């Protein structure tokens with residue numbers, strides 16, 4: 705129903721392989737690969753505000769689903785894309801050669817980003833406030 | 834008694850002036866100044882683990898009070914210093930020309946970092962799980 709919450713990273717797969725594939729320096733990969741931080745989502749209807757802890761970087765993006773928005777990626781590149789809401793619990797987008805799916809089930813968010821034959825998956829759990 | 838917990842930044846004063854004085858790139862100052870993230874402390878006796886969201890960076894430091902420690906600063910430089918306990922609820926350290934005081938008051942943490950005539954102050958609040 706609502707994505708709003710603070711989510712602590714529980715586990716992830718292929719962080720290093722994904723970050724190497726998009727061109728992140730090995731120095732940043734090693735610094736960030738073991739960080740299990742907190743991301744925050746605020747949802748207001750179709751409007752989303754994301755404060756994402758991704759490795760050693762914090763990225764803050766804002767978008768209305770269905771509208772073109774400029775979003776900052778891991779590389780610092782700002783891409784223009786459209787994020788769609790599928791059902792009430794799935795955010796779907798594609799930028800460059802990456803497909804990203806953000807799925808909420810109960811208190812668990814599963815983020816799956818596919819780049820070629822690399823599937824980068826993050827599992828995070830809502831902090832019960 | 835215990836600093837352990839997750840803390841969300843509530844307010845801060847003089848971020849830009851402090852970050853300019855320590856030489857952070859202007860582009861990182863502008864993107865980080867409005868981020869209100871979550872920092873995590875894990876305390877075991879005199880041993881501390883910090884995962885700090887500071888602007889658009891995540892910094893992870895460990896140390897034991899009273900023992901010389903190597904700590905990463907906001908600029909990425911590693912400094913060697915000793916963190917002291919003043920009372921039971923204040924952590925105090927000096928490095929370079931900066932004095933840092935971290936004070937716990939119930940669910941509120943206040944971090945005060947003095948550099949010459951600039952006082953950079955962060956107030957955060959415990960996330961109640």
Ligand SMILES: CCCCCCCCCCCCCCCC(=O)O
Pocket residue numbers: 711713742743756757758763765775776777778804806813815826827828
């Ligand atoms: C498409 C813009 C974001 C770019 C950053 C990519 C790094 C992974 C992003 C996943 C965050 C999705 C929100 C769920 C919580 C989390 O996994 O932190």
Ligand SMILES: CCCCCCCCCCCCCCCC(=O)O
Pocket residue numbers: 840842871872885886887892904905906907933935942944955956957
């Ligand atoms: C002593 C250098 C540590 C890294 C420098 C980053 C500047 C901000 C440090 C403040 C963090 C103190 C912990 C309280 C929680 C918080 O304010 O995020």
